[PDB]
Paper text:
The interaction of membrane-bound active RAS with RAF is the first step in the activation of this pathway.
We crystallized the GTPase domain of KRAS (residues 1–169) in complex with RAF1(RBDCRD) (residues 52–188) and solved the structures in two different crystal forms, I and II, at a resolution of 1.95 Å and 2.50 Å, respectively. In addition, crystal form II of the KRAS-RBDRCD structure contains an extra salt-bridge between RBD R59 and KRAS E37. The structural superposition of the two crystal forms of the KRAS-RBDCRD complex shows conformational differences in the linker region, partly due to different crystal packing interactions.
Residue numbers in the entry:
A (entry chain B): 55 to 188
B (entry chain A): 1 to 63, 66 to 168
């Protein structure tokens, strides 16, 4: 079929079905935003399979149909303030509130990088990417 | 951190993607975008332990490509829609495929009945409970629209993988 296998940041992947006329950006917007990723923080590459390099950067507005049959990869731009969380168990002796549900938080979990504090039953609502501008 | 490789299987349109995206992004996708191949990674805290869920969202329309991801998978969410008896019976075919690639009757699985928000129910809870009882696996009622039981479905499958590892 007229599909493209695109490897995504953080060891993820998707297979998009190219509609005639769509750009790489049009085909990959939903796959990135559903995974909590911003297209402005990413670049799209063509995986090279010869001795020259490992991949070559492509313009986001490139016609996707012209790359049918090639393997692509989307990576974070250089040094974007996006990383993965570092969760840790944490008992709040002093009164605290959950960042997800705003209720009382006695025994919760806190990310040691961004400070996101939450109940265990609220962890799935924590955003996938950890924003670190420290 | 322990990584759990999860695979979501089921007939086309039962809500495999809507359940996964509701877990990852906390948003309900109300459009029909038939999946070809989609993998997701997300940290979740389950019973005090943080773990990384590597979820493979598969195609209900089957675009032999299943066997490869069925061999490497650690747990499976066999999903059907409570308003689609055909998908409820299709569950048997998916468990047959998984057992054919795992070479064991003891595979971590969780039967998931989705679309519980709809009043046009054709598969009642007793039926799915009996089917899950027949397979020796848990059963979870979910609704990706209301997020009901979405966490409960994935939390249960992880616990099935933990006890399967002894
Ligand atoms: N009311 C309701 N609609 C749902 C629910 N889950 C999914 N849907 C609807 O079901 C349709 C198909 O959902 P989708 O997640 O794409 O299903 P799928 O099982 O992944 N399909 P496919 O196999 O093709 O990839 C969409 O219109 C979606 O909004 C639910 O719990 N309640
Ligand atoms: Cl890079
Ligand atoms: Cl919601
Ligand atoms: Cl992550
Ligand atoms: Mg789908
Ligand atoms: Zn964080
Ligand atoms: Zn909370």
């Amino acid at each position: 079929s007229n599909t493209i296998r695109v490897f995504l940041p953080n060891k993820q992947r998707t297979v998009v079905n190219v509609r005639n006329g769509m750009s790489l950006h049009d085909c990959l917007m939903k796959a990135l935003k559903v995974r909590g990723l911003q297209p402005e923080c990413c670049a799209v590459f063509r995986l090279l399979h010869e001795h020259k390099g490992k991949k070559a950067r492509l313009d986001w507005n490139t016609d996707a149909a012209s790359l049918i049959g090639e393997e692509l990869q989307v990576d974070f731009l250089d040094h974007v303030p996006l990383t993965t969380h570092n969760f840790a168990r944490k008992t709040f002796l002093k009164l605290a509130f959950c960042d997800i549900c705003q209720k009382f938080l006695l025994n919760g979990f806190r990310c040691q990088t961004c400070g996101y504090k939450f109940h265990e039953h609220c962890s799935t609502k924590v955003p996938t990417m950890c924003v670190d501008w420290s | 951190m322990t990584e759990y490789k999860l695979v979501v299987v089921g007939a086309g349109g039962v809500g495999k993607s809507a359940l996964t995206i509701q877990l990852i992004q906390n948003h309900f996708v109300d459009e029909y975008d038939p999946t070809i191949e989609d993998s997701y990674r997300k940290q979740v805290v389950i019973d005090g332990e943080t773990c990384l869920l590597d979820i493979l969202d598969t195609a209900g329309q089957e675009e032999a490509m299943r066997d490869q991801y069925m061999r490497t998978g650690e747990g499976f969410l066999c999903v059907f829609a409570i308003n689609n008896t055909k998908s409820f019976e299709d569950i048997h075919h998916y468990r047959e495929q998984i057992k054919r690639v795992k070479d064991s009757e003891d595979v971590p699985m969780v039967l998931v009945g989705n679309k519980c928000d709809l009043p046009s129910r054709t598969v009642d809870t007793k039926q799915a409970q009996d089917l899950a009882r027949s397979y020796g696996i848990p059963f979870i009622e979910t609704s990706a629209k209301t997020r009901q039981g979405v966490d409960d479905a994935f939390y249960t499958l992880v616990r099935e993988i933990r006890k399967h590892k002894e």
